[PDB]
């Protein structure tokens, strides 16, 4: 028997063993997340520890089959993934040091507390204390206090840990034959050995920067309009040509500009579409919300939910005693077990969230027939891109009128379209420079292009230049402001939110064309279009079995990430923004700062 | 008026594992086949060669009842000319099979929260099964070229795997009880008629 035949048999054993251990761990994890008890924490840890130990052993066994002797690409994909990063390429000591560093940074972030001057007992966590200030307060000093105190007391703790974290991650990545840890992260998009669909790790940097250049004009005009509106609210704090102060952006970091809508809404006399009252008037419950979401996916030709989904999911908050983690999640336990965990309320937001989460489920069901190791999105940005486009269609006035939640007499004028698109841009477009700049800084740090004594100097130079955001207080190299965001201190790659944003509008434009939609892209509803559902399903069933470039081509007809559908979606706003900024300065100077 | 003991096959407390599938020879009795086909309790009732519709008007020398448990998605493998882990390694039907395949969902009996590891199937074998062959061996499968010495190791796997039936599984992974009826015709007494 050849080496390839041995690997096929080895993967045959792994799949059945992994499916069984993964189901026990997910079941144990589900029981804790729905029923928080000390006994359930131990059972989750016990099952989870066996699952991790099994993966560590199987990864070592997989490394005894060299990839150089395998010709079947589907076999090589599964073998390579399990070869993962190996069962720690570093020494046991360095792996132990790295794991303690990761745990300490996570604990500092989740338990970091800030106390108001003159009362050392009235202290606030980030969630919900500091987040509430940054999202709702209009007071300049209160927002500044929360923004600076978080970085000066929690970020400074993370600075020495992050420095050692970079060294150990690069050692692990370089011993895995990557240039650095950033190059390791970019490997999620790498494709080899498929003629016409290959993709290199370095190509991701080029494509992200190339597409970001085309985003700049839209972001510049959104930045100018937002600055003008904020300057009216805070006349003595904002320069007409300068960057936006970092603490006046709607959350702790300015990752999203969503909470700036109240101060920047174009037409403040036209209310939002809020069908929450109509849902309560018709006595909707959580089951009705998920029944309507199920009908939406059936209308495009996708299967209905399994019987186990309705029996085993938790679609409402359990009660007053039995506690549960209420973060909405879609669960793929394997063995045909698909569930949604959600503490659903009768609101428009939860109605759209159900469509988002059931979109995850449809993706999970579609590639269930794939081998265990290929049961995932084509790349890290596919899954949430699929989930986002479901809420796009479900939220349109056209869809809300067909299900009886929006009255037919209600008609939409171009002022409500501008209001809606501006709100969309604050969240979707506002995060793109933030996401790209943050990951570029981490890529350069891992590359070694930024020395340690210039981490914060470079961090705020790039914030001013790329994001048009300026720090309100000078920060020396005792600060670790990037680590004050969850993803940086908890070791999560961040470019996935940039690529996913471009994927979702590529998906939506292709599906809406297959649905023969007429008019602006943002008004489209793919409901009742089996042509759109079939085109999406052709990609969903692939899982990870094919290169993401091919999986993308199945939906949109193109092999690469493209920014034109994003700009097509926001074109009515872009035209409106350019007219609004005729009397305003567009762009920003990087030398102005609020601390003069 | 000796009635064929079909209750002992269909209503057994525990079924056999598919790799060790059970066979019950039925002889010298009266079989009311129409009761089974017109009971509406089975999800699968497919007959090959013979017709389920009122063909209890025929006589056979011997009738064999093979019973075992598999998962729902593997029921399609109990049919002539099928491939897969069950058909190739556990239970094989011939191309010219004359008989009926009967199956029904048994999630209420063969599933248990935490996992029911009583039912096994053969995952590896050197070659495919001949029709109606049974292999209950526990020899360690040699996937490589180094002898296994009778214990698991690198390229050395225990050939039998477990379903681990839990109640929350999807239908395709839930346990199904299967009864296969073979109708033999020799130049012989023909002792099983069954009006
Ligand atoms: C890679 O290997 C898989 C399985 O090892 C091949 O798929 C099998 O194809 C045969 C027919 O040639 C089917 O009978 C099997 O059911 C298939 N199994 C699976 C798991 O798909 C696949 O064709 C191989 N690919 C290449 C390019 O050789
Ligand atoms: C919650 O968990 C406990 C054990 O920790 C268990 O006894 C109890 O039945 C569970 N309750 C529910 C509603 O699942
Ligand atoms: C799903 O649809 C199928 C028809 O294809 C039907 O048989 C089944 O009962 C449906 N299940 C649910 C939960 O709606
Ligand atoms: C979908 O089709 C039904 C008829 O099958 C129709 O009543 C409904 O209005 C349609 N909805 C949309 C959004 O096209
Ligand atoms: C809405 O349409 C009217 C009619 O053409 C136009 O005058 C107005 O400027 C439009 N509002 C916009 C584009 O915001
Ligand atoms: C199994 O038991 C049920 C209920 O007693 C009965 O109706 C059925 O006929 C039995 N099965 C057979 C094969 O006799
Ligand atoms: Zn999601």
Residue numbers in the entry:
A (entry chain A): 19 to 614
B (entry chain B): 333 to 527
The authors write:
The binding of RBD to the receptor hACE2 is an essential step for virus to entry cell, thus we first explored if the binding of six SARS-CoV-2 variant (including Alpha, Beta, Gamma, Mink-Y453F, Mink-F486L and Mink-N501T) RBDs to hACE2 were changed in comparison with wild-type (WT) SARS-CoV-2 (the first strain of SARS-CoV-2 which was isolated from a clinical patient on Jan 6, 2020, GISAID: EPI_ISL_402119) RBD. Given that residues at positions 417, 453, 486, and 501 are involved in the interactions between the RBD and human ACE2 (hACE2), it is important to understand the detailed binding of these novel variant RBDs to hACE2. To further elucidate the molecular mechanism underlying the binding of these SARS-CoV-2 variant RBDs to hACE2, we prepared for RBD-hACE2 complexes and obtained five crystal structures, namely Alpha RBD-hACE2, Beta RBD-hACE2, Gamma RBD-hACE2, Mink-Y453F RBD-hACE2, and Mink-F486L RBD-hACE2 at a resolution of 2.9 Å, 2.6 Å, 2.8 Å, 2.4 Å, and 2.7 Å, respectively. Each complex structure was comprised of one copy of the RBD-hACE2 molecule in one asymmetric unit.
VOC Beta (B.1.351 lineage or 501Y.V2) was first identified in South Africa (SA) in October 2020, and has rapidly became the dominant strain in SA because of its high transmissibility. N501Y in the receptor-binding domain (RBD) of S protein is a common substitution in Alpha, Beta, and Gamma strains, and is often found in combination with E484K and K417N (or K417T), with this combination described in the RBD of both the Beta and Gamma strains, respectively. For the detailed mutated positions, in Alpha RBD-hACE2, Beta RBD-hACE2, and Gamma RBD-hACE2 structures, N501 is located in a loop structure and could be replaced by a Y without creating folding problems, it seems that the N501Y does not induce a large conformational change. Some very weak hydrogen bonds are possible between N501 and ACE2, but the phenyl of the Y501 side chain could make many new favorable nonbonded interactions with hACE2, i.e., a cation-π interaction with hACE2 K353 and a π-π stacking interaction with hACE2 Y41. Thus, Y501 significantly increased the interaction between RBD and hACE2 compared to N501, so the N501Y replacement in this region of the interface should be favorable for the interaction with hACE2. In addition, the E484K substitutions would seem neutral or even unfavorable because it is far away from the RBD-interacting residues of hACE2. Therefore, Beta RBD and Gamma RBD exhibited a higher binding affinity for hACE2 than WT RBD, but a little lower than Alpha RBD, consistent with the SPR results. The deep mutational scanning suggests that single residue mutation K417N or K417T is likely to have minimal effect on the binding to hACE2, and that the E484K mutation may predictably enhance the binding, while in this study the structures of Beta RBD-hACE2 and Gamma RBD-hACE2 indicated the mutations, K417N and K417T, decreased the RBD-hACE2 interactions while the mutation E484K displayed little impact.
